[PDB]
Amino acid sequence: PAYRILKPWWDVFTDYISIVMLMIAVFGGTLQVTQDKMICLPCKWVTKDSCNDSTGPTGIKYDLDRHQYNYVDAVCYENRLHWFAKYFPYLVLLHTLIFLACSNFWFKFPRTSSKLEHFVSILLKCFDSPWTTRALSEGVLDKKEGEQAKALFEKVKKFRTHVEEGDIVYRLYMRQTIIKVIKFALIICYTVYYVHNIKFDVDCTVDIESLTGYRTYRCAHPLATLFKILASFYISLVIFYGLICMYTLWWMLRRSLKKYSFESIREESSYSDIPDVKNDFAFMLHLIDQYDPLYSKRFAVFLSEVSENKLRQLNLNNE
Amino acid sequence: PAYRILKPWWDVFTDYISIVMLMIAVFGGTLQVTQDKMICLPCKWVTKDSCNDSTGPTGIKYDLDRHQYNYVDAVCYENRLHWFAKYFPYLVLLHTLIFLACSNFWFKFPRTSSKLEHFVSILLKCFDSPWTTRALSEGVLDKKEGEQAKALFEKVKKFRTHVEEGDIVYRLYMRQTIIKVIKFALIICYTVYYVHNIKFDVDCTVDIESLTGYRTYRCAHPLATLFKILASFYISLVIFYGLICMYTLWWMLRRSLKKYSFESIREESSYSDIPDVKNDFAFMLHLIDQYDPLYSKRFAVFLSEVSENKLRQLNLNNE
Amino acid sequence: PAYRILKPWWDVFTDYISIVMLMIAVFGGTLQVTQDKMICLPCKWVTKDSCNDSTGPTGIKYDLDRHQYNYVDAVCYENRLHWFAKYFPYLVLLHTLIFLACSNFWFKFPRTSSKLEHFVSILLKCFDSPWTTRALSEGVLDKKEGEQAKALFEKVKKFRTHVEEGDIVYRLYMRQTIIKVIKFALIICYTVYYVHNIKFDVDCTVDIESLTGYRTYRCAHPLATLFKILASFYISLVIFYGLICMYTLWWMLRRSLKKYSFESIREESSYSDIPDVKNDFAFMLHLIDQYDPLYSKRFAVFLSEVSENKLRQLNLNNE
Amino acid sequence: PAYRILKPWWDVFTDYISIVMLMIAVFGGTLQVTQDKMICLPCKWVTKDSCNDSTGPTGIKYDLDRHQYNYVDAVCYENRLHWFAKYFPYLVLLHTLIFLACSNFWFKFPRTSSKLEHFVSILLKCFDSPWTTRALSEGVLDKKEGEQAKALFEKVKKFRTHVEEGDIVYRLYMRQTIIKVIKFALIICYTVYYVHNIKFDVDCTVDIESLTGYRTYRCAHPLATLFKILASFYISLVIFYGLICMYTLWWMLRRSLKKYSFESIREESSYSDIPDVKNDFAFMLHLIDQYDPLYSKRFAVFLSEVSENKLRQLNL
Amino acid sequence: PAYRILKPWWDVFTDYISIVMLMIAVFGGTLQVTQDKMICLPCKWVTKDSCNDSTGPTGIKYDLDRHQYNYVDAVCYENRLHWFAKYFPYLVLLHTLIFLACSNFWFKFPRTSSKLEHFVSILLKCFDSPWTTRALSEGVLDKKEGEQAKALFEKVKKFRTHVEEGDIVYRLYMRQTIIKVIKFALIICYTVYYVHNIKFDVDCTVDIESLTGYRTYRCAHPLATLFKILASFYISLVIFYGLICMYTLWWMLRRSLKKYSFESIREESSYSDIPDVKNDFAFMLHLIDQYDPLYSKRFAVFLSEVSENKLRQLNLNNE
Amino acid sequence: AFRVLKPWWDVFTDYLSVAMLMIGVFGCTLQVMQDKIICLPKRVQTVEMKGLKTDLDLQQYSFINQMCYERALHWYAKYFPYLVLIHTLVFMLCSNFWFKFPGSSSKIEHFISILGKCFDSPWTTRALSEVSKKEGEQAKALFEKVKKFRLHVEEGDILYAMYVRQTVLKVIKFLIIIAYNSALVSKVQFTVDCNVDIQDMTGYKNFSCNHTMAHLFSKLSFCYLCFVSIYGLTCLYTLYWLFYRSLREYSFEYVRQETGIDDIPDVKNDFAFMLHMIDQYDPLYSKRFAVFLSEVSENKLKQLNLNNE
Ligand SMILES: CCCCCCCC/C=C/CCCCCCCC(=O)OC[C@H](COP(=O)(O)OCCN)OC(=O)CCCCCCC/C=C/CCCCCCCC
Ligand SMILES: CCCCCCCC/C=C/CCCCCCCC(=O)OC[C@H](COP(=O)(O)OCCN)OC(=O)CCCCCCC/C=C/CCCCCCCC
């Protein structure tokens, strides 16, 4: 719909980063489901559960069947591959889903969603109202435009009485931003600390000697360096998702967003009776200013009693 | 949408070239995921970690299991296949994603997107204005048409004083073109430099003699040649892309786009009072002239004060 | 959309042939990706690097591992399978992409696209106007309908002045047809010459005797006969495509498409003042004549100034 | 494009049968691409280039590598498996694509498409015209509806003069029907004569003795039997298609569709002066009658000149 | 589309059940195409074509290659596997296609489709008619509204005269229900009878001793138990489908739907002269009663001749 | 638009149902994999170690694999995703059962339609200003519509009983799912001991198998258990909100205190339940609707229109 004006540049950037991280999750999950395996070769000479590592060259004969090799691979994939290298794509998918839910929670939570829909609808209809152009131009008026302007003025008064008492939208946005930086810190810590465990060479000691004949095996995890790449790329994107989110926190704490002053508008335009608004009205007008400040300007004429008197007088001239 | 008027032939060409390069990236990535492998046979005769290459013929017996062969393939793919031959499609996908982000950044960044939507709306409504047809023809006036013409004149003035102050759109387009040309330079450089490393036959020396019995192997990379006929093709596309971007670069440095001259338009039409617009207004009018000059003509009648005087006289006539 | 009137029967036929051609390309590319391989068996008995081709029967033992067989297949696929059999579907894909780009170049190129959109818009709106029906019936004329007819007359005159000056659309269409027909010639020549190289049995002599033990191998290419018939089928399509292009080229050279004559239309109709349009106007009028003569016949009355005088007199009686 | 009025029950039935033949073709093509293989085992005991077929049983040792087996499979698949069992899905693809092309050629060809759209537009406008309701009810008439009815009348007369001269639409529909029925006959003949060659057990004799050691092999074609059912069931569909097409041919040879008789409608209605239309307009009125009688009955009132006189004197 | 009012609850339920059955068919078809096989092992001890079943344990040496095993698997899957366990998904697919054809035949068959479209169109238009609202409330009538009411009233009369002659829709619906229930019975009979033939352990005596060395083998069909439960689930759905069909059949035998008495509405409403429609009118009215009786209530005031007289009088007052 | 009657619990349960459907689809796709179990026989016949030669073909190994997959692997580990699919289909079907009933949907649409007519009517804020030409006629018409709604929906109680039924069904399904899944989650094990009697076919009787995706199915089962636990806690809160206070009656006494009108009565039954629903959505709607419910306010409107005309 028309919620694009309610999403500043930081929200758009975080949404696109979430899309790329979802692409990472899907790609890694497809690879982990389809082609993730280990190629384990037994160590012929062992030195206290450690490989001893010791006329032409001829191949070492292990006497294992193909299914014994498959059993060794499965056991050393389950028991000795690190949990990060196995469940990295699913952790990424979980983190992306939580990030998306946090970013789009207030669009689905009924109390905030109703207020946001009301605000966006009245602001779109106000910005598209011809009375805004007529008033900012400062008697010719179309009749239907006449009671349209009057009804929209009354609707603006209704909305101010209906939204301004509460701050649920602002508090919800604050909590979403706080969660989206706490989770970013936790993700960065546990992902940077455990990314080094995605290795290509894995030495496994699984004690399946009664079924295979060997205790220690040397295994190759083929989709590891790629998992070292994707994770690194993921650690890049999350870092961006952190920094942007941190800026949002700064944007919500550098000044009080529960108070909006129309001082510039009544400084420029003639209608100096335009009051200052509080709470969710103030925060949503700040969000609108993050998209296009002109959307605020054409709204301000609808908040003034002098404009109400002028509209009433001109309508009364008309009908 | 109606943004096609803001995308000249260079932007459309780059979009299609990026679509083709994205197809290349997806195809190469699918092949890399599914079938990229090495087929490594050990060298029986060796000379200091180098293959010596020295009645009926009989096959050479290596005494290697299938899983030893798989391990040798995995190790020589990880350690001895060049990183370009393994991550060419992913680099191409990343480069296309960054190219498409640069091409479509100003349509998504709220500060520029709001102004672009504003300009597109006002220009499209001026294009379809009946007053434009009557004025370019040079009486009878439907009242709705008259007030819509006057209100759109005032809207032209308001949009002008809103946009002419700043040049954010021009700066963003400048930065996008600069990033897209330096990225083309970097891509052509490192891609031409490393294209020789995509070879079919790779001599791998990985020191897994304690696990296989052989030290040197001669691997075959089946997907090398196709990657080459991908990579060169990708290179070709990049070259075209770069050349197109270079033209766009020169197009914004050949003449000062920030000072649009209405000299030809005001010379042809009766209205010789057209003021020269400044900054983003000038840049977007140049972008419109690239698509269709007639639009600019059909916009000029809304910027001249002589046509405004004619409309005011006509309005006083019918009113 | 409504560009379909600008696509005659030859363009639609070539579009359908290109679609089925793209299906060929996708099908062959999928088959070459997934199942294109060689099954190579060494020639045990050889005479001067040539297969000598010499108590129940018992199998021939080659003493080759599965991996030696895979290496032999990869090397004889790379070095001795003909490049046409390997890269036929990719060549088909490239050829169809260039064919589709040439077919739809003028729709995306802004200079021709703007002119074509303008022509289609005013021609459709000329069709929709009931003044055409009233005039070809030749007062009964609504005031608003008469004013829309006058605005349409002015728009038609303005568009004639705008578009008759240049012939970019005709030149672009001629160039596209010429490029398509010469590409058809090249494709037919090289595909017909190289279609004999797609064979099921391929004798390979790759000199991997140090790694395998044999020099000459006899390989079976399973996706050869199909890759033959598809190619033949593809060839047939190209021939059809080429023939269509030939006729189109002849259609642009039999008579001067830049000198349109309204001789039959203005002879059958009462108005004998309809002038002969030229250049692009003539070109788009001929392309419309290919679709339906009714469209041109209804445009002739808005191209006539005597019909304009009759409309002026009728509207004069109306006011 | 609202062309559903031009498709009688035979056309809709053939379209659905062609869609199900498309599904046959895609399914069989996917199977023939992915899992159409052959499993060939050498015949140990050879008797003049043929298989002799002669406490605890022990498995037969052929001394063949897995790659020799794959080579034998490929060679006996290409050389000895009958081409019908290999290219039935591609043939059904081609046949049903030609069927779709024959069905939609008159919709895509500009010469017939323009006339089809022109007739459909004025038929739909006359079907919703208020004057038609008034006259079939048969003076109250608003000026605007009278003007639009007179305009639609003049459009009807001019389009009658424009279309009644030619008969290209009927000719194209005829040609499509004959091509469809003869292709039905050809498909049935060759498919029924060749459906018996899809066998599970195939004896292959390819003479690769220098590369394998054996000359005659016995091969199993795993996807044969399924194809057989597909082929047989595909055949059934074509039969229905042909029968349906047969009826269409019979319909277009039952009476001359280039002459449409309004005799019943102009007899039952008050206007007994309705003229008999000819050629293409007659054929498309016949198709519309095959869709719904009410459309033709309603359009009958826009052709009589007594209704024109009544409209003129009501407007006067 | 707009046929939702025509389909009762049982049609929607059968459509959902058909969708789930088609999901069964697709899932079983993919499993049969991809993973359906037999894994046959020869019985070493054979006594009269029967598996006789007679220090450290060691494996049985069958001395069979992988390809002889594949040949045995293919032969036993072809011969000694029951046709139900092989073609269950295809039979399900055919049954669902026939059920969907029967359920949606009257919407595609032109003779019934024209009548249904006519009835639905005029019923929806009468529902949306403002004269309906006036009649239920029983004035200010815009002349467009008044002419709409009179013309659509005449349309209702003409539609009644056009559709009261035939009863094709009722007959077609009856035939569809009867076919859908008799095919239900046949499906249950043949599916329940042969559901026990989907076994996991299957003995095959295929007589390929000259090619394998053994006559009897003991195969394990892996996709049997799953298929079994799928069949059970399919049977469950079929039973539900059948039950629904029986109710529909009962719904069309409880009362003659070709005689729809308007008794309740004509007692409730003031217009007590609403005539009792017959044949297809009555049947479609009964269907719309099953969907929503408010449709029939709002359509009833447009059939009564007292409503004719009152609408005529009030229209006379408005003229 | 029925979204105005979807509280936070309903939306949360719908999203949890979508997530559980995703889990079930992913589990089925994992079940599609051919390589499922890997079995090796038991007691098969610096130190240099040598491999144990089991003396078995590949077909013998595959036969052992399918035999132990069918007869030794627990049915939960093989059919858990299908059970998740069935359970989430039941949850999705029984979560919209209050909405998609024939008689209930018309009442819901009527209530939300006239409530939106209120929320957009000038006579509501006009009536608050009264408490604190054309619009008067529309006010009178909407007031007749409000009385029609009172006589049209207030009689029945189908909506509340139906919502209670669907909530109880959700709760009992959640309880059954949690109980049996928590009981059988211990059967998803990596190492399995298979003891099929195929000594006559292979030579061995005891096998040790590994279920390759047993770890993945265990994680999926725990995630599904967490999702079902959240779903059940949400449904238990829905039950608590349904039964902790009588939703069959709604008191307008808060408006009686706020609005000076005391003729405003206390409606009941479906009227009460849907007022509670829209109070969960937005509490302003009921407060603004109350000034249209009272009939002394209607007399005041009639007097105002009488003086105006
Ligand atoms: C986090 C939740 C995500 C959920 C998504 C689930 C996806 C489910 C996919 C179902 C897979 C079913 C097919 C299983 C085939 C198993 C084959 C196998 O084991 O692999 C063998 C072999 C791979 O091994 P090698 O050739 O050595 O290659 C690896 C080293 N280069 O593969 C095969 O033989 C065939 C594999 C079938 C692949 C099918 C899936 C491929 C999907 C493509 C990935 C994404 C598209 C391309 C991305 C490009 C970048 C945009
Ligand atoms: C022009 C280029 C642009 C288009 C290119 C698209 C790229 C598509 C990428 C596909 C990746 C997925 C591949 C997964 C498998 C890879 C390796 C593998 O396991 O396959 C080998 C093996 C080969 O064995 P057989 O075919 O028995 O060989 C004997 C020949 N009788 O293949 C398989 O069994 C697995 C097949 C999996 C892929 C299936 C895809 C095939 C799709 C068919 C397309 C046509 C469908 C409709 C056609 C209608 C009739 C024409």
Which protein residues are within 6 Å of ligand 2, measured from CB? B 27, 30, 34-35; C 25-27, 29-30, 33-35, 89-90, 93, 222; D 25-26, 29-30, 33-37, 89-90, 93
Q: What is the dihedral of CA F78, F82, F88, F94, to 10 degrees?
A: -120
Rounded Cα distance, D87 and D94, in Å: 11
- The dihedral region occupied by A274, where left means phi > 0, alpha psi between -120 and 50, and beta the remainder, is beta
Span from the CA of C28 to the centroid of ligand 2 (angstroms): 10
Instruction: Decide if F47 contacts E54 (C-beta within 8 A).
Output: no
Q: Does A110 touch chain F (CB under 8 A)?
A: yes
CA nearest A220: which of A81, A116, A45? A81
Q: Residue B105: what are its φ and ψ, rounded to 5°? A: -75, -45
Q: Do F29 and A214 touch (CB under 8 A)?
A: no
Instruction: Decide if E274 contacts E265 (C-beta within 8 A).
Output: yes
Instruction: Name residue E17's amino acid.
Output: I
Instruction: Decide if E202 contacts E238 (C-beta within 8 A).
Output: no
3-state secondary structure of F95: helix
Structure tokens at F219: 């994680």
- Please give the class, per CATH, of domain D3-53+61-315: mainly alpha
CA nearest B31: which of B210, B204, B188, B224? B224
- Max CA distance (Å), chain C: 114
Tell me which of A30, A223, A230 to substitute to probe ligand 1's pocket, judged by most ligand atoms within 8 Å of the beta carbon.
Answer: A30
CA nearest D228: which of D192, D187, D185? D192
3-state secondary structure of B37: coil
Task: Give every CB contact of residue C37 below 8 A, 6+ residues apart in sequence.
Answer: C73, C77, C221, C222, C223
The verdict on the CB of residue B86 being under 6 Å from ligand 1 is: no
Task: Give every CB contact of residue C289 below 8 A, 6+ residues apart in sequence.
Answer: C296
Structure tokens at F147: 């009385």
Instruction: Decide if A104 contacts A40 (C-beta within 8 A).
Output: no
Instruction: Decide if A232 contacts A21 (C-beta within 8 A).
Output: no
- The dihedral region occupied by A235, where left means phi > 0, alpha psi between -120 and 50, and beta the remainder, is alpha
Ligand nearest to the CA of C226: 2
**A40 to A13, A88, A195, D99, E150: CA distances (angstroms):** 43, 21, 22, 56, 86
Residue nearest to atom 45 of ligand 2 (CA): D30
**E41: chain F residues, CB-CB within 8 Å:** 59-60, 63, 201-202
Structure tokens at C285: 């009028």
Tell the CATH topology of B3-318: de novo design (two linked rop proteins) (1.20.1440)
> Which atom of ligand 2 sits closest to the CA of residue D93?
50
Tell the CATH topology of A6-53+61-318: de novo design (two linked rop proteins) (1.20.1440)
Beta bridge pairs of residue F208: F40, F193
Tell me which of A26, A32, A35 to substitute to probe ligand 1's pocket, judged by most ligand atoms within 8 Å of the beta carbon.
Answer: A35
**Number of neighbours of residue B173 by Cβ within 10 angstroms:** 22
Task: Give every CB contact of residue D79 below 8 A, 6+ residues apart in sequence.
Answer: D204, D206
3-state secondary structure of D36: coil
Residue of chain A whose alpha carbon sits nearest to that of B68: A41
Residue positions counted in chain D:
316
E225-251 vs E83-103: helix axis angle to the nearest 10? 30
CA nearest F172: which of F83, F226, F79, F91? F91
Give the start-to-end residue ranges of the domains of chain B: 3-318
The verdict on the CB of residue B166 being under 6 Å from ligand 1 is: no
As to burial, measured by CB atoms within 10 angstroms (0-12 exposed, 13-18 middle, 19+ buried), residue C100 is middle
Q: Which residue has the tokens 């399919």?
A: E234
Rounded Cα distance, C110 and C80, in Å: 48
Q: Do B110 and A59 touch (CB under 8 A)?
A: no
Burial per residue of D56-77, b for 16 or more beta-carbon CB atoms within 10 angstroms, e otherwise: ebebbebebbebbbbbbbbbbb
Distance between D264 CA and the closest CA of chain C, angstroms: 32
In eight-state DSSP terms, residue D290 is H
The verdict on the CB of residue A224 being under 6 Å from ligand 1 is: no
Beta-strand ranges (E) seen in C19-81 are 39-42
3-state secondary structure of D255: coil
Rounded Cα distance, E4 and E120, in Å: 10
Task: Give every CB contact of residue D94 below 8 A, 6+ residues apart in sequence.
Answer: none
The sheet with strand A39-42 has its strands ordered as A39-42, A216-220, A201-205
> Which atom of ligand 1 sits closest to the CA of residue B30?
47
Rounded Cα distance, C10 and E221, in Å: 56
Q: Residue F236: what are its φ and ψ, rounded to 5°? A: -65, -40
Q: Residue A203: what are its φ and ψ, rounded to 5°? A: -95, 120
Instruction: Decide if F91 contacts F170 (C-beta within 8 A).
Output: yes
Q: Do B68 and A41 touch (CB under 8 A)?
A: yes
What's the domain range around F239? 2-45+52-308
Beta-strand ranges (E) seen in chain D are 39-42, 201-205, 216-220, 259-260, 277-278
Rounded Cα distance, E239 and F94, in Å: 21
Q: Report the domain count for chain F.
A: 1
3-state secondary structure of B128: coil
Instruction: Decide if B116 contacts B3 (C-beta within 8 A).
Output: yes
Ligand nearest to the CA of D74: 2
Q: Residue A179: what are its φ and ψ, rounded to 5°? A: -65, -40
In eight-state DSSP terms, residue F100 is S
Rounded Cα distance, B244 and D106, in Å: 43
**B73 to B59, B67, C67, E138: CA distances (angstroms):** 21, 10, 10, 88
Instruction: Decide if A75 contacts A216 (C-beta within 8 A).
Output: no
Beta bridge pairs of residue A217: A42, A204
**Number of neighbours of residue F226 by Cβ within 10 angstroms:** 11
Ligand nearest to the CA of D86: 2
Distance between C64 CA and the closest CA of chain B, angstroms: 5
Tell the CATH topology of E9-318: de novo design (two linked rop proteins) (1.20.1440)
Rounded Cα distance, E290 and E296, in Å: 10
Instruction: Decide if C228 contacts C211 (C-beta within 8 A).
Output: no
Residue of chain C whose alpha carbon sits nearest to that of B37: C74
Which among B66, B147, B215 has the least Cβ separation from residue A57? B215
* Angle F5-F7-F8 from CA coordinates, rounded to 5°: 155
**A106: chain F residues, CB-CB within 8 Å:** none
Instruction: Decide if A168 contacts A115 (C-beta within 8 A).
Output: yes
Task: Give every CB contact of residue C270 below 8 A, 6+ residues apart in sequence.
Answer: C138
Task: Give every CB contact of residue C261 below 8 A, 6+ residues apart in sequence.
Answer: C276
- Max CA distance (Å), chain F: 113
Residue nearest to atom 19 of ligand 1 (CA): A35
- The dihedral region occupied by A255, where left means phi > 0, alpha psi between -120 and 50, and beta the remainder, is beta
Q: Residue E207: what are its φ and ψ, rounded to 5°? A: 60, 65
Q: Do E74 and D220 touch (CB under 8 A)?
A: yes
Q: What is the 3-state secondary structure (H, E, C) of chain A?
A: CCHHHHCCHHHHHHHHHHHHHHHHHHHHHHHHHHCCCCEEEECCEECCCCECCCCCCCCCCCCCCHHHHHHHHHHHHHCCCCHHHHHHHHHHHHHHHHHHHHHCCCCCCHHHHHHHHHHHHHHHHHHCCHHHHHHHHCCCCCHHHHHHHHHHHHHHHHHHHHHCCCCHHHHHHHHHHHHHHHHHHHHHHHHHHHHHHCCCEEEEECCCCCCCCCCEEEEECHHHHHHHHHHHHHHHHHHHHHHHHHHHHHHHHCCCCCEECCHHHHHHCCCCCCCCEEHHHHHHHHHHHHHCCHHHHHHHHHHCHHHHHHHHHHHHHHC
Chains D and C touch (3+ CB pairs under 8 A): yes
Q: Residue A217: what are its φ and ψ, rounded to 5°? A: -130, 150
Instruction: Decide if A296 contacts B114 (C-beta within 8 A).
Output: no
Count of alpha carbons within 13 angstroms of residue C64, beta-carbon side: 33
Span from the CA of C26 to the centroid of ligand 2 (angstroms): 11
**End-to-end alpha carbon distance in chain D:** 38
Our separate counts of H helices and E strands in chain E read 12, 3
Rounded Cα distance, C232 and C24, in Å: 11
Residue nearest to atom 7 of ligand 1 (CA): A30
Instruction: Decide if A79 contacts A204 (C-beta within 8 A).
Output: yes
Burial per residue of F265-283, b for 16 or more beta-carbon CB atoms within 10 angstroms, e otherwise: eebbbbbbbbbbbbebbbe
3-state secondary structure of B45: coil
Instruction: Decide if D276 contacts D226 (C-beta within 8 A).
Output: no
The verdict on the CB of residue B70 being under 6 Å from ligand 1 is: no
Rounded Cα distance, C43 and C219, in Å: 10
3-state secondary structure of F198: coil
Structure tokens at D163: 């279309």
Residue of chain F whose alpha carbon sits nearest to that of E9: F102
Instruction: Decide if B80 contacts B202 (C-beta within 8 A).
Output: yes
Interface test with C, best of D35, D65, D218 (most C CBs within 10 A): D65
